[PDB]
UniProtKB/TrEMBL annotation, chains A, F:
The organism's taxonomic lineage, starting at the top: Archaea, Thermoproteota, Thermoprotei, Sulfolobales, Sulfolobaceae
Molecular functions (GO terms): ribonuclease P activity; rRNA binding; structural constituent of ribosome
Domain of life: Archaea
UniProt key word RNA-binding: yes
Keyword line: Cytoplasm, Ribonucleoprotein, Ribosomal protein, RNA-binding, rRNA-binding, tRNA processing
Name of the molecule in the record: Large ribosomal subunit protein eL8
Automatic annotation (TrEMBL), chains B, D:
Residues in Nop domain copies: 259-374
Family: Belongs to the NOP5/NOP56 family.
This protein's UniProt keywords: Ribonucleoprotein
MF GO annotations: snoRNA binding
Domain of life, per lineage: Archaea
Taxonomy of the source species: Archaea, Thermoproteota, Thermoprotei, Sulfolobales, Sulfolobaceae
Record carries keyword Lyase: no
PROSITE patterns for the chain: NOP
NCBIfam families named in the record: PRK14552.1
The protein, known as: C/D box methylation guide ribonucleoprotein complex aNOP56 subunit
Cellular component terms per the entry's GO annotation: box C/D methylation guide snoRNP complex
Pfam families: Nop, Nop5_56-rel_N_Arc
UniProtKB/TrEMBL annotation, chains C, E:
First-tier enzyme category under EC: transferase
Protein's organism: Saccharolobus solfataricus
Family label: Belongs to the methyltransferase superfamily. Fibrillarin family.
Residues engaged in binding S-adenosyl-L-methionine: 85-86, 104-105, 129-130, 149-152
Gene3D superfamilies, per the entry: Phosphorylase Kinase, domain 1 (3.30.200.20), Vaccinia Virus protein VP39 (3.40.50.150)
Listed name of the protein: Fibrillarin-like rRNA/tRNA 2'-O-methyltransferase
Record CDD domains: AdoMet_MTases
Coiled coil, from the record: none
Entry-linked InterPro entries: Fibrillarin (IPR000692), Fibrillarin_CS (IPR020813), SAM-dependent_MTases_sf (IPR029063)
Keyword tRNA processing: yes
Alphabetized GO MF terms: histone H2AQ104 methyltransferase activity; RNA binding; rRNA methyltransferase activity
Name of one Pfam family that matches: Fibrillarin
Length: 122, 375, 227, 375, 227, 122
RNA sequence: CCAUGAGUG
RNA sequence: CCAUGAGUG
RNA sequence: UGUGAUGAAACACUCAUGGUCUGAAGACUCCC
RNA sequence: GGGAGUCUUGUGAUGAAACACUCAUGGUCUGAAGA
């Protein structure tokens, strides 16, 4: 897929899926593509997660651009259904965002700091 | 570990302390630097940077740009980036000077002469690629149509109030503006109205007589031919502008199937162009959530609700879509919400260079519409 | 008419025919005005009338800018150069010795900035998004003053980012706060405080906070020093 | 003593008690009654009134209308009026009936059938005399001219914005909108500019090279002929529009010298026309105080001061007078006040049918302008 | 849908498809509408929907007008007839037997009053100035109701002058007080006290005072009896 | 002059000027054409005084029309200098208005009633 | 609609 | 500018 | 200079940039 | 009233103030001082 800028290992992918869940419980998230876009424009998002099996792709292709303008880190997970069922939904979702990490602060800080290393940051 | 600097000045390597390890100065040539500054935007390494990585043969390289990092890896080295590194600052702290040190110029006097005329030339160039965007024409065009739309309405309203000094009965007898305009334009004095030139317009025989009887029985004023030919200047223009609009709607369609097919597929060229005008470009419309597209064009209404916690606009310029202004009041809100959703997908598939997919986008949309209507 | 120096370098006030007082800067390119301003000769020198109502910096001064870090021979990064109104006047001030870099991502408007930038070797046009200081990185040096008048919701966050690229340590930053372009909901006076704290948690030493009214409604400029 | 009534029904005489002394019924004829209805407006008694003044030969007669009294005195009688007299009242209280009683109609049924048709036709006639006024064309003409003024300006700003996608530098090179649209009309591509089309415009040779160089080094966008034609449709309309204005301008000049010579003499045809549009007519303009004419057209500022007790506007549309907007703030007020003053004098001679006196008024005006400027 | 009489003659209410209640009158000229109003058939009779927002009379009715002096066959003089919206409806009310004389001095508007006056023998159009009843003296009779809806600063005086010509004793005057057209500075509510006193000095007996808001802003209608 | 509808006997013309004067002292008056125009427009003038020797005739011509619209009586004086010098000015005046008679009530009420007899009113 | 920078008749 | 009545895109 | 002295906020537009709704429910069907 | 499934739905359910214009009427500054 081409809106996929960098590469996510399933350990990295999973820490996300857990990370989302704790943020429904202990923090604040926004679920859905339209809300994730508004979440970025607004600089509320601390971490943006994008599914890899979206069709058509161009639906979420704009998120990488936006996230750099607002300097918000982005990560991929492999299935959209999987990201939704994390989200407290029983249908799929192509992208989601954490505004408040909560009792996943330590967990998110690990991911957001790991995708930087795979992105070549010192 | 070598920190790599890239500047108009050339290509520089540093040790971690900030001491100049090695350099390869660029040629004092506007032409090549301008192209390479544009290339480095896409991640392409300076050609002079390529040489410097050959002389020194580094274990670890770190660049200023994260976009450069993969290019130099494809070239064989291990690369990372640090955005605001202490080395990059050190380099530039010494830039009034190290321009002279590596002999890019003799003195400060004309390094600044150059960097000024590079900058004039580097941005002269960027100014041009902006002008080359195709959606700009679409935007300007559709702006001009709405300008003709307005004018026509204005000139039409004027002619009628004016031409009614002579023939007041024609105004409420001809609903349509262009039609009215032709009648003022071909005839003049009401007493020249004839079945033949009037059967030439297409007027059914019944309306023609209703017209001719009214012309006979008009309590309007007997008025000179100068007055009348003066009014006719306006009537003709109304006619020119309709012909011109009809040309611009046709031009616009051309640019609009070209630059944004799916949007067009959904809402047509005029309305779609219109959203491009409002968003500013195609790439700005692409980045919008639907919640904006839905309210684009209701900014008085929008922020009124936003400042006060009041009721929001249901729809913006989107009001123009047939389904929306015709369906009863309670349905507009949902239709709009559904259109905007598709529009944003559509805008996004169009900008990020997707091929036409408008058939299912319409199909999906009429589904969401048919459901709404059955309640 | 009478013209005399003010407490700040290369900046003057004028006594006039009626008994009126207007700021001005010493005209670097005589016989030439970037907007419509009066040109005035006094003892055979030409100065440019500096409308405060148009330029944020003249406002800040006429609203009491205690001290001014932009002077004769200063190097500046000017985010949001636009058509070139204010940057043409800082060209008059920094005056050939010193240099000014103009970042502006709006081409319709850089179109007229080109003109102002031809006539003046002070000014270095750069068409870029100040959100990516990487894209103009390879043309500038470091600067003393970072003048930021850009219309953005994170204009300050941007400013801080550009800062950690190009602001010499102990340089002064003039950051312009647009309340109504950060949020039209919030009370402007609430915003300045909330943004000034942004600069101070990122260790700028707020020297002075100036409210531009009436020169510019819902506007404030902060001067702070970078550490 | 005999009290006298005038109506469609005819002419009737009453003693003060309210008994019909003698009557002479009107003809139940639309054409004739209408006329005598228009005539009784100017004092002319019905013909039926003159006969009735003869059958009984009354020492004291009294009528409803005061314009009739001088006419009936000229027939030899002693005449006055009591406007809303007990008799006139007693007369109409019985109008359902006394139409039949003096045998004007057989029954109540077709007295109204007729009185309706007279009412229809009496006013239809007045509707016509009104549309027939000379000043309406003066007003409609200049309102329309101003409608064109606005339009030309709008398209010109569109066209500048639009053409500059292709050729930006041209915008700042031609102040005049008409000159600029003319360039785009004739040439199209920026590369078709030739010296002779440029010397034909009136362009001095120095400008000519600045333009041809500008086109050469342009950082503009290269564009299709379809794109150029689009722009040029807008360009060509701008030119058309410039012509029509001048035609209208001439048309207006005549009218404004015909219906209102004196007012035209002071401020020129349009502004005179303009003030005719705001007042609504010449006769309504004539009855105005100067203090109103002075501010006509600044209704927003006026009612702002009057609502709030703040400061009032110095000038309305009167601002357009060359002397006013060239002159400084403190002179404007004195110039407006003086001008408006001369204007009511100009207007009043016009409406109340005075012959031309515009010269000394101007003299008087320019004098006061001079006293004012000499301070 | 259901249509039923109201307390006032030839004026009706509708139960509707949804349950909104709107005023209407029995259409004197079936299949024909004077503004855009809805035509509604019930048990084979046609009524005209009477929008209160356009017509002041329907407002006063919808605001609790005690008694309506306009009924089957009333003879009414209606000053300021304008386009014929309201006067078309009082035609429906008076019903061929009754007669309505309509004054209006703006030619631009009598133009459409004409159209309305043609289909309706109820209506006797007059392009005239209500300030000079000498002009329409020769076409009209005396009247039961004097409906005065004119935008004039001396509108009350005009009404009065018109009354002592055409108003039967113990006859009624409905006078619309248009405040903002009387004086834009004064409080609308002060205007009303002063105008009713005017009525009360000319031996008019103020019967009811209604405010038309929200249907017409800063507007009031007075129903009073002339003695 | 032609804008004068009727003829004023000088016993009435003079009793006019005197009624003006008592109204400066005990009442309220207005002087000049533009102000009369407003005092007529506003229904403030009870009596409106217009000169017969005005030049050019058209300046004050609208007042008869106006006054008949607002049903405000109007009267003529023979000399313009005198009407102005009556007003407490040392210059002429083309028209004036009494707003409040003050101690010319009985005096005015008599004029407006004599100018009525000369107008053919019962 | 608000704010800011450039312009028109 | 406010209020009223008639309409257009 | 009352045939108006003094005071004193005329109107129509274009471009650029930012501020640009809500967020999980809605319709149906079968058992006693 | 208790239990129970089905279709649509974060690729967006529910709620919810799009905008541009013309005509007609009226409300339409101060009032004796100025060089
Ligand atoms: N993201 C961004 N990067 C650079 N410039 C921007 C920007 N966003 C907005 N701007 C520009 O900032 C300008 C603000 S007006 C300020 C101009 C300058 N301060 C002067 O006084 O002359 C606008 O013209 C706008 O085009
Ligand atoms: N002096 C006068 N004589 C006759 N009509 C007048 C008048 N002054 C104003 N008018 C008219 O009064 C009208 C008020 S609008 C009236 C609305 C209408 N009566 C209805 O309810 O349907 C305006 O059209 C105006 O033209």
């Amino acid at each position: 897929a081409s809106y996929v800028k960098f590469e996510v290992p399933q350990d990295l992918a999973d820490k996300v899926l857990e990370a989302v869940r704790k943020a429904k419980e202990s923090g604040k998230i926004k679920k859905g593509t339209n809300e994730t876009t508004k979440a970025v424009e607004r600089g509320q998002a601390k971490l943006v997660i994008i599914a890899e099996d979206v069709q058509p792709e161009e639906i979420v292709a704009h998120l990488p651009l936006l996230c750099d303008e607002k300097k918000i880190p982005y990560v991929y997970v492999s299935s959209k259904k999987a990201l939704g069922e994390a989200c407290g939904l029983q249908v799929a979702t192509a992208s989601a965002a954490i505004l408040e990490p909560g009792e996943a602060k330590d967990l998110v800080d690990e991911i957001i700091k790991r995708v930087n290393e795979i992105k070549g940051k010192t | 570990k070598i920190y790599l600097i890239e500047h108009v000045i050339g290509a520089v390597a540093y040790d971690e302390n900030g001491n100049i390890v090695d350099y390869i100065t660029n040629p004092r040539d506007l032409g090549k630097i301008t192209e390479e500054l544009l290339n480095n935007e896409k991640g392409i390494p300076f050609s002079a940077t390529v040489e410097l990585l050959k002389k020194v043969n580094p274990q670890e390289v770190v660049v200023e740009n994260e976009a450069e990092v993969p290019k130099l890896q494809a070239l064989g080295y291990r690369v990372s980036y640090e955005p605001y590194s202490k080395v990059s600052r050190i380099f530039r702290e010494s830039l009034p000077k190290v321009a002279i040190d590596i002999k890019f110029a003799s003195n400060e006097e004309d390094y600044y002469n150059f960097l000024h005329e590079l900058s004039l030339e580097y941005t002269r160039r960027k100014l041009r690629s902006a002008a080359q965007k195709r959606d700009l024409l679409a935007i300007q065009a559709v702006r001009a149509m709405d300008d003709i739309d307005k004018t026509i309405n204005l000139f039409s309203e004027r002619l009628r109030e004016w031409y009614s000094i002579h023939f007041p009965e024609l105004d409420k007898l001809i609903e349509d503006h262009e039609e009215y305009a032709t009648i003022v334009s071909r005839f003049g004095d009401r007493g020249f109205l004839t079945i033949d030139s009037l059967k030439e317009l297409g007027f059914n025989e019944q309306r023609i007589n209703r017209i001719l009887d009214a012309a006979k029985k008009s309590i309007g004023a007997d008025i000179s031919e100068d007055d009348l030919s003066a009014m006719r200047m306006i009537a003709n223009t109304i006619l020119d502008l309709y012909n011109i609009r009809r040309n611009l709607n046709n031009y616009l369609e051309g640019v609009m199937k070209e630059v944004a097919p799916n949007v067009t597929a959904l809402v047509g060229p005029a309305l779609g162009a219109r959203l491009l005008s409002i968003a500013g470009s195609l790439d700005e419309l692409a980045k919008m959530p639907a919640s904006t597209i839905q309210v684009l064009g209701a900014e008085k209404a929008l922020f009124r609700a936003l400042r006060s916690g009041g009721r929001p606009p249901k729809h913006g310029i989107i009001f123009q879509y047939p389904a929306i202004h015709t369906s009863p009041r309670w349905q507009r809100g949902k239709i709009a919400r559904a259109l905007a959703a598709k529009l944003a997908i559509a805008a996004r598939v169009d900008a990020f260079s997707g091929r036409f997919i408008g058939d299912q986008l319409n199909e999906q949309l009429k589904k969401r519409i048919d459901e709404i209507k059955e309640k | 008419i009478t013209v005399k120096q003010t407490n700040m370098e290369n900046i003057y006030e004028c006594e006039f025919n009626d008994g009126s007082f207007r700021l001005c800067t010493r005209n670097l390119v005589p016989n030439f005005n970037v907007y419509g301003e009066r040109l005035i000769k006094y003892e055979g020198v030409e100065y440019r009338e500096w409308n405060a109502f148009r330029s944020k910096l003249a406002g800040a001064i006429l609203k009491g800018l205690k001290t001014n870090p932009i002077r004769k021979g200063t190097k500046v990064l000017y985010l949001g150069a636009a058509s070139g109104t204010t940057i043409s006047h800082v060209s008059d001030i920094i005056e050939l010795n010193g240099k000014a870099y103009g970042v502006e991502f709006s081409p319709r408007v850089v179109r007229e900035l080109l003109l102002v930038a031809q006539r003046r070797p002070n000014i270095f046009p750069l068409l870029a998004d100040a959100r990516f200081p990487q894209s103009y990185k390879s043309v500038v040096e470091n600067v003393d003053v970072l003048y930021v008048d850009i219309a953005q919701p994170d204009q300050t966050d941007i400013a801080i980012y550009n800062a950690k690229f190009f602001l010499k340590v102990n340089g002064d930053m003039l950051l312009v706060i647009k309340a109504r372009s950060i949020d039209v909901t919030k009370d402007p006076k609430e915003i300045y405080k909330t943004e000034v704290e942004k600069l101070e948690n990122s260790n700028f030493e707020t020297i002075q906070i100036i409210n531009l009214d009436p020169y510019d409604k819902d506007h404030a400029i902060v001067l702070s020093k970078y550490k």
